[PDB]
Amino acid sequence: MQTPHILIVEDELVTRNTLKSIFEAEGYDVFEATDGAEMHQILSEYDINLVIMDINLPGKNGLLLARELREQANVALMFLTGRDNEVDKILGLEIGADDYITKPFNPRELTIRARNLLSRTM
């Protein structure tokens, strides 16, 4: 029924372009932030159903951005990050992300996890 709105918080242009075309190929509207200030402004200004969080960002890192997000909102959240190590994965989940996916990733896996998560939260 409702058109899903996805926010990708991701500092690399090429990765954003890829994520955008993957999610548009799902019928979603894609909002883009390169950092924490752009993220907060999109979140205060537009309906957002799912946040995809990179960790290595200019300014605050994705984990802390996630922590702040979780004090305001219970919006669906998934990390998508090149931080492919057990500690960051566990922290990201502990902080309250619904999922944690490493780059490089299978795009089908990303979109099916997003879809099941959205079905559960929208």
Add this chain to the structure above:
Amino acid sequence: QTPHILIVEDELVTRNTLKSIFEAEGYDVFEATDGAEMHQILSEYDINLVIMDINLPGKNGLLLARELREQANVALMFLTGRDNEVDKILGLEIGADDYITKPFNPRELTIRARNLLSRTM
């Protein structure tokens, strides 16, 4: 309410370990080795999360998950030695909320279960 976990797993050392992992979380743990036992526990008790192994005696867990999904939206995670991209993608497509491979980090497992239960309960 205290969470009720149904673990469907036919290897008893694995299952005993899951049972103790989840009891250490304060959860009530129900156990099944196959689909007949799983369906009986689902009719008799209130189950908040199903942890589903794939290689089972009788019907495989992907098929049991598919049947389950036609009857119920219950929280579901695969936990399985099928560490391949095809089965992962299939399990998610069938509607599992997560898919976790053995060997597993028990902390990853309890935290993912906790977050999922926070959504569904």
